[PDB]
Every structure is written in C-alpha cells, then in structure tokens.
Amino acid sequence: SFAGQLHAALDRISDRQAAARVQAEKFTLGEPGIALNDVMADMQKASVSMQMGIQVRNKLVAAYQEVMSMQV
Amino acid sequence: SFAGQLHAALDRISDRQAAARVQAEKFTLGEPGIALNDVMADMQKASVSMQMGIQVRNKLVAAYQEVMSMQV
Amino acid sequence: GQSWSLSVQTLVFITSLTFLPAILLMMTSFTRIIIVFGLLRNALGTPSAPPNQVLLGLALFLTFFIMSPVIDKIYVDAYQPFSEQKISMQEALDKGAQPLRAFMLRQTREADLALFARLANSGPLQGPEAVPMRILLPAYVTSELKTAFQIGFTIFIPFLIIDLVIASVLMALGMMMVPPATIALPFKLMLFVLVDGWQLLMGSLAQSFYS
Amino acid sequence: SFTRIIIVFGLLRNALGTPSAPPNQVLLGLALFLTFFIMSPVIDKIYVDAYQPFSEQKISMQEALDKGAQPLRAFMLRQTREADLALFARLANSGPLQGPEAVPMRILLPAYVTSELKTAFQIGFTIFIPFLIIDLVIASVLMALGMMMVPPATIALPFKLMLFVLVDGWQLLMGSLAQSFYS
Amino acid sequence: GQSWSLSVQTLVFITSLTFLPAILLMMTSFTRIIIVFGLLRNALGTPSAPPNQVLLGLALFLTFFIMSPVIDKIYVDAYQPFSEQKISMQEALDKGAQPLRAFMLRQTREADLALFARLANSGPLQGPEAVPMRILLPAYVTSELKTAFQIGFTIFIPFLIIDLVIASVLMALGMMMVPPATIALPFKLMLFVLVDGWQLLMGSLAQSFYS
Amino acid sequence: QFAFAAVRTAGEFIGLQMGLSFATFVDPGSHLNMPVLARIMDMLAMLLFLTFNGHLWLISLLVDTFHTLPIGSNPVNSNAFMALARAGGLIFLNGLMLALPVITLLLTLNLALGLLNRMAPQLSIFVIGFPLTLTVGIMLMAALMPLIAPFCEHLFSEIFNLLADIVSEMPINN
Amino acid sequence: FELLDQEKFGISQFSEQVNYQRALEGELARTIETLGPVKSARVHLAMPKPSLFVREQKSPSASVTVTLEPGRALDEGQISAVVHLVSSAVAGLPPGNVTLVDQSGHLLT
Amino acid sequence: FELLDQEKFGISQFSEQVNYQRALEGELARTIETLGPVKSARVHLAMPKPSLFVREQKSPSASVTVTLEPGRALDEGQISAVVHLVSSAVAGLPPGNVTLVDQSGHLLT
Amino acid sequence: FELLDQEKFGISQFSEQVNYQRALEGELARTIETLGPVKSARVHLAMPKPSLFVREQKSPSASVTVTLEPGRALDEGQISAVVHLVSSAVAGLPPGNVTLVDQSGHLLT
Amino acid sequence: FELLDQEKFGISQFSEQVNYQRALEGELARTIETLGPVKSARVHLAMPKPSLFVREQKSPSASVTVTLEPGRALDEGQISAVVHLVSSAVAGLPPGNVTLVDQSGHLLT
Amino acid sequence: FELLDQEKFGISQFSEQVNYQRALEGELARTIETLGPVKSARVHLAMPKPSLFVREQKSPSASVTVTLEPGRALDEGQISAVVHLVSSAVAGLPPGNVTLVDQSGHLLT
Amino acid sequence: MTPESVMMMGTEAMKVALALAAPLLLVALITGLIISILQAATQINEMTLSFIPKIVAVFIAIIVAGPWMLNLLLDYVRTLFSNLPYIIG
Amino acid sequence: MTPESVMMMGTEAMKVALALAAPLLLVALITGLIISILQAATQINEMTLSFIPKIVAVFIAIIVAGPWMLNLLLDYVRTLFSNLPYIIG
C-alpha cells in the first residue's frame, strides 16, 4: 500500500486547502460567526502543510533520480 | 501534435504577457479605468505563467538529455 | 466528486513530468525497437557505424508514428474534458490510462501475467479487463524483451549464413589466414543496402507492432 | 532488499555476450518491481506495526523504531549465514550463546551483505554456465573443420540469444529467484 | 499583428540552442560523412589510424563549406529581416527552415517518403513540396544512411582487391601458412598516399552532395 | 589473484594444445580462442573461495594487520615487495602440476599420430589431427574434475600462509 | 489429400498453403457429390488475409457449383445443407459468403 | 493411427498439425459408422490454432455428413449422440458448432 | 492442376503468383463452360499485388468472354450466375468489377 | 502402450503428446471392454485449451462409445462405473464431461 | 503465355516485368481476335509505376488496333466491348485510356 | 516459438549455403580431379601444380554464375524480413 | 556448498559438449579417413585435397542431427534453472 497512502496524503492536503479557501470565502462575503484570526491561522496551517508536502516530494524525487541514474 | 501544443502554449503565454503589459501602459498613460488592483494582479499571473513555462522547459530538456545520452 | 486544488494539481503534474518522459518511454513504447536496432548494428559487422544519436532520433520518430492512434485517443479523452473542465484530475488519470492499459495488454503474453499474479497473491480474475497497473507493466516489459531477442536472432541469421559461406569458400580455395570478416563486411553491407534492410526492417517492425 | 537481483541481472547481461543489450533503466525498473512484489508481505507488516499505533498517536518513536525494525531484522536473519555471524561476533567480541537472540545491528548487517553477495555470485555462475557450454561447442565444431581463425563471437551470440529466448529464460529465472528468496 | 514577447523569444532561442548543434547538425549533413570516414578507417586495416578528433574536425569543416550556399540563403532571408526587427520569430523560423526543407526534399528517396507517409496515415499531398518536416526528416535520414554505405562499399573495394591479389601471389609459391595482412598494409598505404585518396575523396563526396 | 591466475593459465594451456594456439601468428583481433576453455576455470575458482568464505577470511586478515601495523610514522620495510613478487613463481609451478595428465596424454596422442607418417606421409593433420585431439581433450576434462577439487585448496592456503607471515613478520622486521 | 501424400525437395512457403487449399476444395466437393440430388460439385475457396498497417479481418468466401441429378432441384432447406456443409468446413467462413449455383445458372444463395 | 503411419523427411510443422487433423477426421468418422443407423459418416473439422498474447476467441467447428442405412432416420435424441460424439472428441468444440447433415440434405442440427 | 503441373526446381518469386493466376483463369473458365448456354468461356484476372504509397488497394477485376451456344442468350438473372461464379472464386473481387461479354460484343454487365 | 515402445530420432514434441494420448485412448478402451456387459468400447479424449484466469477454462472431455453385449443394457449405477473409470484415468477430467453412448444411439450420460 | 512458359537460366529483373507485359499483350490480342467482326487485333500496353505523392500521378494506357473482317464495322456498343475487354484485363487501367483504331485509321474511342 | 521452427529456420538458411557454394566447390574439386587423372603417364610433378588451375576455374565460375548467386540472397532475406510480423506469432 | 557441488556442475557441462560434438566430430574424421585412404594408392594430392568434401559431409550431418542436438541444450538448462533455489541451499 504505497500509491493509496500517497493519494490519501494528497487528499488530506487538498481538503485542508479547500477548507481554508471556503472559510475565507464565507468570511469575505459578510457571513457572521467567522473570525479573522481563525481564518488567518487556518490559512497559515494550510501553507505549512503544503510546504511539508513539497519538501517530501523533492526529497522523494531526488532519491528516485539518484537510485535510478546509477549503472548496473 | 507536440509542435502544435507547444505553439499554442507559447502563444497563449505571450498573449497573456502582452495584455498585461498593454494594460499597465494604459494605466501609466493616465487614461482612466485602471484601479492598480488589476495591473499588479495580471503581472503576477503572467510571472506565474512564465515560471511554469521555464520549469516545464527545464524538465523537458533534462528528460531529453537523459534519454539521448543512453549508451546504446 | 471532490476536486484537488490548483496548487497541488500543478505539483502532481510537474512531478509526473519527471517520470512520464523517462520511464513511460523507456519501458513502454520502443525498448524492443532500440534492442533490435542495437542487434542489427552488431550483426552488420561494423559496430557503432551509425551514430547513436541518429539511431535514437529515428527510433523516437518511429515510436511516435507507432503510438499515434492511442496517443490521439488518450489526448482527446483526457485533454478535451479537462480543457473544458468537464472532469477532475483524479478521474481523468484513469480515463486516460484505460486505452493505454488496453493497448499494453493487447501485446503481452499470458504465462508472464499468470506468474506475476501468483507471485503477488492476487485473487483470481474471471475477467481479463481487471489487471491493475501494479501487475500489468512487468508482464508487458518481459514480453517485449522476449520478442525482441527472437526478432534480432531472425535478423542475425542471414548475415551469419553469408559469413559462413564466404569463410568456407575461401578456405576451400586455400586461404587459411585471411580474415573473412574484413572481406565479408563489404558483401554484408551490399546485401543489406541492396535489399533495403533499413526501410523494409522498420516497416516490418511497424507492421508487427500493429498486429 | 535487492542488491542480489541487480548483480544477477548484470551477470546475465554479461553472459549474453553483448554489453548493455537491455537498457540499464529497464533493468533497474524490473529489479525494483520484483523487489516490491517480493517484499510486499514484509512491507505490509512493517506498515501495519508502524502506522497503526503512530497514525492514531498511541505510542512514541523511541519504541516505534524498535517495533518497526524487529520484523525486518527477523526476516533478514534467515537470509544471513551462521558462519558470517560467528566471524563478526568474534571480530566485535559479542556474546555467542547457544541460542541466537537479538543479534546487534553492527553484526547483522555486514553478514547479510556478504551472504547476499555470495549467493548472487553463486546464481550468476550457474546462469553463465550454459552460454559457456554453447561457446565451447561452437568453437570446437568450428575448429574441427578447419575454421580455427573465424571469430566464434559473431556465431555464438545468435545461438546464445536463440537459446535464451527459446527456453523462456526470463519467466523461469525470475520465478526461481523469487522462490529462492522465499525459501 | 501578433508576435512573441522578448522573454519567450529568448527562452525559445536558448532552448533551440540545445538541439541545434547536437541533432540539427548530427542528423542533417555530415552523418554520412563520418560514416564514410569510419568505414575508411576500418578498411585501412588499422583501428583509429586517423584520430577521432581530427576526423570530426575535418568532417565539421567539410560540412560547413558544403552548406555555404544554404547558409547564405537562410541568412539573407531570415537574419537580416530579423536582426533589424522587421519580422517576428513566429514566421521568421518557418522562412529560415524553408530552404533546408527544400534541400532535404531534394536529397530524399521517394520510396522512403511514401512508406513514411503511409505509416503516418496521411496521403492527401498534391505535390512533393507540401510535405511536412515531420514526415520529411526520417526519410532524409534513411536515404542518407543508404548512400553512406553505398559509398562505403566502393571505398572498400580497392583494399579488398589488393589483399586478395597479395594473398594469392604470396601463397602460390608455397607460403600458404603465413598471414599476408602484415604485408598488405604497407602496399595499401603506399597506394593510398600515391593516389592521394584524401583530397580526391573529399572532392568526390562534395560532388556527390552537389549530385 | 595468483590463485586465480594459476587456475586461469592451466585452463588456457589445455586449450592451446588442441586448437586454441592459432594466435601464435601476428596479433589478431579478438583472441578467437579465449572464452573456449578459459572462463570455465576463470570463474570456477571463485566458487571454491565461497566454499570456505568469500570475504570472511580476508576480513579477518585486515583486522589482524591493524594489530601488527597500528598506523604510525614507522617507515615501510624493504625486501618485502620482491618476496611477494617472487611468489609467482607458483603461477606456472602449480599450473603444470595440475596440467601433468593433460599435457602428457595429449602429447602421446600427438606422438602416436606422427608415427603413421612412415606408413602414410599424407596423414593430413589439418584434416584428422584436430578432430582426434578435441574429443580426447574434452573427455579428459570431465573425468579430471575431481582431481581439481582439492588441488585448488592448495593455492588458497599457500597464499594465505605466505600472506599471514608477511603481515605478521613485517612489524617485528623494523 | 494428394498434397499430404505429395513429397518434394522444394519447400515453397506459399505453394504450401495453396497445395492445401486445392485439396480442401477437392475434398469438400467430394462430399457434396455424395449428397443425393447432386451429381457433381465444384467448389472454389477465397481465403485472403494479407493487410498492411491495419487490423482488417479480410473474411473468405466460397462458390459451390453443384450439378443436380437429371430431373431434380434443391429445396429451400436443402440449400442450407450445402451452405453449412461448406461454411463450417472452412475456417472463418460465414454462411453469408457461400455461393451456390446450379448447372443452369440459377444462383440459389 | 494414420498420423503414426505418416512419418517422412518433411520438416514442415504446419503439415504436422494438418496430417494429424486429417487423421482425427478419419478416426471420428470410423466410430460414427459403427453406430447403428449410420452407414457411412464424413466429418470435417475447422480447428483454428494460432493464439499467442491475444484475446481472440478462435472457436472450432465440425460438419458430420452421416449417410443413414436404407430406411432409417435419427431420432431427436439420436442427434445429440452424434453431436456429443464429435463435440467431445475435439478440443474446445462446443456442441453448438457441430453440423449434422443426412444424405438427403436435411440439416439435423 | 496447372500449378500442380507447373512444378520445377527453378523458383521465380514473381512467376509463382503468375503461374498460379494463369491456372485460376484456366480453372474458372472450365466451369463457366460447364454451365449450359455457354459453349466456351475465357476469363482474365487483374489481381494487383502491389500496395506501396497507395491509400487504397483499388481491388481486383476480371473479364469473362463467354461464347454462348448457337441460338442462345443469357437472361437477366443468368448474368449474375456468371458474375458471382467469378466474383466469389477470386479473393477480394466484388461483383461490380466483373465484366461479361458475349461473342457478339454486347457488354452484359 | 505400443507407442511407448516405439522410439525415433525425430524431436516431434507435439507428436509426443499425441502418440501418448492415442495410447491412453487405446488403454482406457481395453479396460472398459473387460467389464462384463460391454463387448467393445471406443474412447476419444479432448485434452484442451491450457490457459490462466480466462473467462472459461473449459476443461478436457471424453466420449466413450461402448457396444454392449447382445441383449444387455447398462443400469443407472453401471453408467457411473464407466464414467468414473474414465474421469479418473485422465488428468483434470470431471465426470460431467464424459459422454457415454451405446451402439444404438442412446446418449446415456 | 508462351513467353511465360519459356524458362531461361538468366533472370533479368526488368526483363521480368517486360517479358510478362509482352505476353499479356499477346494474350489480350488473342481474345479480341476471337470476337466476331475482328479479324486480327494488336494491343500495346503502357504500364508506368513511377507515381507517388504527386499532383500528376498519371495512369496505364493501351492501344488496340483491331482489323475488322471484310465488310464490317463495330457499332457504338461494340466499342465498349473491346474497351472493357482490355480496361479490365489490365491492373489500374480505366476505360478512358484505351485507344481503339481500325485498319483504316478511324480512331473509334 | 517452438524449437522446431528454429530448426526449420536453420534448415532453410543452411540449404542456401550448399546451393550457392555448389558451383564453386564442384568446379574446384573436379579441377583437382581432372589434373590428378591427367597426372598419370609419367606422373612426375613438382609438389602440386594444381592450385593455379583452381583459381581460373572458380574465377570464371563466379563470373558465369554472377547475379543468380546474389539473386537468391536478395529473395531469401526479403521473405524473412517480410515475415517478421509473422515469426512473432 | 560442499566441493562436490562445485565439481558436479562442471561434469555435465563437458558431457553435453562431449555428447553434442561427438556426432559432428566423428563425421569429420570418418570423411577424412576415406580421403586419406584415397590419398594413398596413386597418392597425387596438393596438400590434403579433402577440405571440400569434409565441409559438405559435416554440412549434411547438420540436417541429419538437427533437432535433438538443439534439444540437448534445452532441457539441461531447465534442470540447471530448476535447482537455482536449491544449489545455494
């Protein structure tokens, strides 16, 4: 179970980003009950998650290239 | 075909950049109708498009070199 | 269904831009072509006579011409709904891979996939149209590198016959320490160019891939 | 995991008599695919014993590392060799004991490495032997008729490839390698 | 009017700078020249008697000279309208590539062109000129590869004749069991240097290029 | 690799006695005779190394060399490179000892065939001699395999005995 | 029948699948003769599968030419007897390709 | 039987799987003869053999041509006797492909 | 028959598919003779093997030249008898390419 | 049995697994003869379609053709005697594929 | 025809497709002779295959030179008889390229 | 593919070897035979006096053979190249 | 692996070579001996004069031997590949 786990990770990241986006969209239209500090914190958490994801992607692709560029 | 797709992508990138540049020029010429909230956004989107294009170019040339340098 | 955000869509697309040109070309489309080209170059008796870059470019062009139909099918079925935002990336991947999977399965063997399934401990399939991408690729790769060897051997045979007959006739006429290879090489080259080995060979390879 | 598979594939490629006849990229891809197919049970067990507590945050890493490493060491112990383990124990002044128990990491890994190298060479020799037989017989028949100066390499190689494709070498070879790894 | 911005134009120029010397030179003019040089090296009965760097330099100089009229044509038709920004890259590239396309079309084999067109599944052409470069390039490569070996066999012939005659005259007097290869090399080299094979062959291949 | 090289030469010398020595003329291209009867023993030797230990015995030497040589400013002793260079030596020594039966038996057949010249001077050894030697020479290989099984072990220990003294007597040679 | 018995040094690849088809036609026509109303049949087959860069099936055909006995005529269900008698004895030949003709013209299929 | 008898220099592999099919047909028709109402049978098979790395069905067929004894007719369950007698003696041949025909037309299947 | 008759050591690659076509024409014309009103037929085929740089094959053609018996004329349905008798005995030949002509001009097709 | 004694230089791999099946059929039919009511049996096997994960594996079948002694008939449990006598002597042959037929039609299975 | 029957050890490649065309012309003219009003025909063909991907592909042509019997003239529908008799017996030759001429000039086509 | 096809492929390929070499080998062998019988009646020779006649006999044999030696080579390889989409299956 | 396992692998490798080559080796010498006898009894010869018949003699032996020589290498390697998980242990 590798591709399934990777797709689950991507699903979680995209879901968090979508939640942040919809919360910001709900706030900017004037719906009560949404806090500016709350939406800012959620957006920052989403950005941190995306940065972690891209770091993992870079590490994995670098390892793949290093391990498959060698000559047997 | 590959040539057609490449031409279409490059032409649309160039059209986006030209539209952004002409909008900025119209703004700096003093003609009313530009609120500075569109020129900056369009310039940023054009820069994003150029970054995507150069990343695709780097990946494509790397792949081409890798497949062409194989010892057959 | 849920749709991935643009920030991760571009990430996954760029990541796929690393594997897709390298592996999806090396072990999917023209491995047999490059193998048989190398074998033909060896059989010609003058290794590394044609430029490797020229051979690779010609092989790539022949590969594109070979896979043009399936390329067109996946191109329309993936891009056009994607271009009009009709489908999401997750479903677009499977929809594009379905015709490619069908074409790949059309060419593979049976014993290879059976052995791979038995190794993977997957449950028996009553319908052939259920092989996952995990099990499909190795069977196709091994079938390709199996058929390439026999095609190369068939190509090798006539030049071997010519070399044997010229060596035999030379030694019958009484030339022991005369290298036949340095003498037969012009004859092998003339036979190849006169029977149009390159054009006929690539046409036959294309027809074999089609059928 | 699979240092032996690439070695045996290289031995087969050299036995074929043609350098880099299959692309190195395709050889590595096939090796990786076979490796993951073979290790799928062990990898699944490791995934369970690691993620299942860790995903729900029930244990700490200071024990999770040991819990995830124990099955891998148990699997590797079968592939290791008693003589190599004993020699490394003598080198590193560790307690031999009558019953093996929790061989240290400093000793277990090199024994596995050298045992895999030894078995890889043993399989490669047997893979090389049939091609050597073909070369011997073709050279002998060429010499017997008075063609001692004709290079058999241009003659042996087509016969080697024909035999290799005719005996369905790839499928039975990979099956035998997988069965050897299993038992 | 439409054109490309400076950034995308320089991006395209830098990208094309990668293909241009490698392939646009390898598979266009002097691949058959280097093939002939390698065949002559093999025919001389000595590995790498002329060094590879020297051979490549001579081939590069020869192809530069050969392509001089086409170079002048493409220069005066593309660079001059482009060096003074009187034309955009979009059509400047096509105008520059047109003379080279015509040269490739002239140096092509009709059978190869027809086979490639049938493989590509495109037969609506009304004239030879309207062919696309995509179908023109592989046929040109194949024709150049054919003529390379066609010249190479003719290069081979004289050394084969010398070897055969020296072996026959050597073994006719009871010296059958001694290799005449070591004795044929001085005679072949003397013949080549006396006939001035290099200068004559360069002119011959230039005339072959001029058809 | 001296143990390998002596084994390598022994197989080659067997081949040279039947049909593999036609490279006696000027330097050819490919040897035309190398993989015929060399690689059979060029790779069988490493298996017998794996019968005892592949790297274990070599590694055990490396640890002991550190005890003998603690890495310092002591200059490397002389009169030792010549001794190990003088070792082979055994490359042709042990090569012929393994080659004792094959060399004699093949030559006796060579001598026997030549005696027929006085009965028929047109024996045509280019016609009859080569086929007759090959079948006997190949046959001797299969039946002489057990003779090689303990013989290879001789070189392994002898080189080990040579190596053990050199690495141990050098530190006390200062 | 004769082709299997026939033995020659030459082993022409083509004349192999033609010396065989000529025997099938002669065997198929020997059964239609042993069928009652038919006095003598004469069948030709049309097997053609060559194609270039295409998946075309290039399906086969046959043309029986029965010569009914004096004063006889094949009924409507006696035609399918001779159609399926040939459609089935030939690989990949549907019954829509078999052509039956009397000794008086009269295309029956 | 005949296949064992049919041994010759002929290295053709195709005439191997054809000299055999011609013997099966002659053996299958020797049993249908020893079946009571049948006086003489005549069966042709339509076995397509090539099938490597493809999903093509390549299903076979047969066409028996029994010639019943004077004054006899196969019953409704005597047809399946001769159908399964051939459907089972041939590899991969369902009973829906066997064609039985009398000496008077009369497609029975 | 003629192809069987034309058996020799010489192996002309072209003259193989031509010595055969000349036999087909002579066999096809032997049946049209045994057809009632026809006294003697004479058929030529136009099978074009070459398929290089051509979008379509363009098919094959034939030209029968029947010579009806004294005082006879082929009816409107007796033409399709001789058309399909040849259209089907030749691989890939539609009935729109067969040309039937009497001994008095009179293109019938 | 007799085929096993026969040995030849030829490597006929296919005629290896066919000369054997022809002996099994002749051995299986020699036992069914030594069975009481049966006077002479005649069995054909259908070893077929080896494959893996196919829609239908099909399996191999057989078709016994016993010829009972004058004035005899196999009972309902005497059929399974001859079915299992063949279903078990052949590798991978279920008893649902064996076909038993008398000398008077009468499919018994 | 007769030239095709003739066999020579030498086989010039071009003289292969020319010794054949000379036989077609002699065979085509032997039928037009057996056509009633015609006393003797004389046909030449103009087969040229150098056409690929060109605006002006070109086509094959023929030129019959019939010599009608004393006191006769081909009708308007008797011309198409001799046109299609040649247009169809030659591969790729439309009826718009056949040229018919009497023994008195008189281009009929 | 079964090993029988390889034997069939070898058999057809090797049969070409005999036919092509047959005119050259036969004329060379008979030439030595022609001299040998003519080397009676004062059989005195020097050593062989037979190799040079082999040259001219074989030399003219190749000339008279000419294209048919190459013509077979053109056809045998052409079928194998054309059968490549069929030797696979 | 005991040393017996090492040497047992070299046995059948040479034996198959002994088995495969012997029919071809015997044909070469048998044909040579006949000509060698012909090289007596009015001994006129050039050097051997036997090369042409010898090549043809073994050439026909290829047809005579053919498949079962090829079939020899086919099963021996399968036996070797059958014990690959078993030679190590």
XYZ file of N, CA, C and O in Angstrom, chain F residues 74-83 166 169-170 173-174:
60
model
N 56.242 4.899 11.359
C 57.235 3.879 11.052
C 57.342 3.699 9.542
O 56.320 3.455 8.882
N 58.532 3.813 8.959
C 58.660 3.643 7.509
C 58.361 2.216 7.082
O 58.585 1.255 7.822
N 57.839 2.089 5.861
C 57.549 0.777 5.300
C 58.853 0.034 5.040
O 59.789 0.573 4.434
N 58.925 -1.208 5.511
C 60.134 -2.001 5.365
C 60.351 -2.406 3.910
O 59.410 -2.542 3.122
N 61.618 -2.598 3.562
C 62.027 -3.040 2.242
C 62.225 -4.553 2.259
O 61.933 -5.228 3.255
N 62.717 -5.089 1.145
C 62.978 -6.513 0.967
C 61.728 -7.363 1.160
O 61.835 -8.560 1.459
N 60.544 -6.776 1.006
C 59.284 -7.496 1.126
C 58.462 -7.502 -0.152
O 57.761 -8.483 -0.409
N 58.520 -6.435 -0.953
C 57.808 -6.428 -2.226
C 58.375 -7.473 -3.177
O 57.628 -8.117 -3.922
N 59.697 -7.653 -3.166
C 60.320 -8.642 -4.040
C 59.855 -10.052 -3.702
O 59.627 -10.869 -4.602
N 59.712 -10.356 -2.409
C 59.308 -11.697 -1.999
C 57.915 -12.038 -2.514
O 57.687 -13.132 -3.044
N 53.816 -12.479 6.082
C 54.230 -11.146 5.650
C 53.615 -10.078 6.545
O 54.299 -9.155 7.002
N 55.248 -10.780 10.278
C 56.682 -10.623 10.478
C 57.187 -9.241 10.082
O 58.289 -8.859 10.490
N 56.413 -8.489 9.301
C 56.820 -7.129 8.946
C 56.920 -6.198 10.150
O 57.923 -5.470 10.250
N 60.031 -6.760 11.868
C 61.184 -6.571 10.997
C 61.787 -5.177 11.111
O 62.923 -4.972 10.671
N 61.065 -4.225 11.696
C 61.572 -2.868 11.877
C 62.778 -2.852 12.810
O 62.898 -3.696 13.699
